[PDB]
């Protein structure tokens with residue numbers, strides 16, 4: 843029952859500062875523009891100890907499966923090859939990505955009927971709000 847409130851299909855409804863976040867991560871112009879235009883559906887499911895997060899959009903379809911606290915190698919939608927660890931901290935899913943001596947954290951939180959995604963690198967944050975599909 844660890845992630846019960848996150849499970850489901852969620853659709854993007856708002857975004858703030860995502861272009862700047864992507865600039866900080868190092869994403870190039872054309873990818874930023876097409877990725878920024880995406881309106882992803884995020885699909886979260888749990889089977890035993892294995893969590894799966896899919897993100898589907900006209901930009902890219904991604905899928906990760908993982909066990910909490912257990913690192914995995916990930917190819918991000920922007921084509922970074924990162925070492926990722928996802929943990930639950932106080933009811934927040936905390937997704938840390940390490941690559942080329944850099945780090946970024948993606949937090950996923952349930953707030954009211956929304957699923958809020960907060961993306962941080964260095965002092966640049968982006969907040970993206972999803973609603974049930």
Ligand SMILES: O=C(O)c1csc(CCc2cccc(Cl)c2)n1
Nearest residue numbers: 864867869877919920959961970
């Ligand atoms: O709203 C989302 O699901 C969301 C926000 S950041 C993220 C990781 C994947 C990602 C996609 C495009 C550019 C970069 Cl730099 C990172 N996913």
